[PDB]
Design a protein around this ligand. Structure first.
Ligand SMILES: O[n+]1ccccc1S
Ligand SMILES: [Zn+2]
Length: 256
């Protein structure tokens, strides 16, 4: 029964998921004066031209926009990565107020939200096998700040009313995730974990330096979602973010 409240939030997760206190937990604070440029990093390649979205689901924690990952249609390669990583879903974490919401922080700065584009390493055949491997996933993290509207997010915003409560889904075909990307692909990378239970330590994190801007009306529609199921008392889906975790013996590298 994990969640984001007092009684079931991040400080409780370690009881059911002891890896919460592990050596490679995410998110982390990115100290820009400690992260070092790595000339060994190869160019990052985001190839989303043939992406095939299918559906959007409120899972009681966030919403997932799901993709057809039965073939190499939307892949992430290059940068720190060896091989090919297939896009399976994206989701966001966000706050109740514009001053909080992101999971990663940059010199302790919190953004209003954070987008996670989740990809799995095709050498392991499926997502479920990939998450049991230290290089099984690659998550592209993108910060959201409140300013101008993001045209490419509006199709997402406008379907949320149809998936207000936990367990609801809606058809969501022909959504282009390229429209959620900032101009620059300058990034930081480090080894980490899923930021939700089961908190598996399988992720190569790639966190873009340049945030995207979204409008206050857009993020306000995120905040109208519900953690609860239909017919239950309303608990707004806000502050579904885990705070920064100890860096331990890890290196954050910069691509720039
Ligand atoms: O929050 N989250 C859920 C699933 C896979 C990755 C991540 S970051
Ligand atoms: Zn996430």
């Amino acid at each position: 029964h994990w969640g984001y409240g007092k009684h079931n939030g991040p400080e409780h997760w370690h009881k059911d998921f002891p890896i919460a206190k592990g050596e490679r937990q995410s998110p982390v604070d990115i100290d820009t004066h400690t992260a070092k440029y790595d000339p060994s990093l190869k160019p990052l390649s985001v190839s989303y031209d043939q992406a095939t979205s299918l559906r959007i689901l409120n899972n009681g924690h966030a919403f997932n926009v799901e993709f057809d990952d039965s073939q190499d249609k939307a892949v992430l390669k290059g940068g720190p990565l060896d091989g090919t990583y297939r896009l399976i879903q994206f989701h966001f974490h966000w706050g109740s107020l514009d001053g909080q919401g992101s999971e990663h922080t940059v010199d302790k700065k919190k953004y209003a939200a954070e987008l996670h584009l989740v990809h799995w390493n095709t050498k392991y055949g499926d997502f479920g096998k990939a998450v049991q491997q230290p290089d099984g996933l690659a998550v592209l993290g993108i910060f959201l700040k409140v300013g101008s509207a993001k045209p490419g997010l509006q199709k997402v915003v406008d379907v949320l009313d149809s998936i207000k409560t936990k367990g609801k889904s809606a058809d969501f075909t022909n959504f282009d995730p390229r429209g959620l990307l900032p101009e620059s692909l300058d990034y930081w990378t480090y080894p980490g974990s899923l930021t939700t239970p089961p908190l598996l330590e399988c992720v190569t994190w790639i966190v873009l330096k340049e945030p995207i801007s979204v409008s206050s009306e857009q993020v306000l529609k995120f905040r109208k979602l519900n953690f609860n199921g239909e017919g239950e008392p309303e608990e707004l889906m806000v502050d579904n973010w885990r705070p920064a975790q100890p860096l331990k013996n890890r290196q954050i590298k910069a691509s720039f």
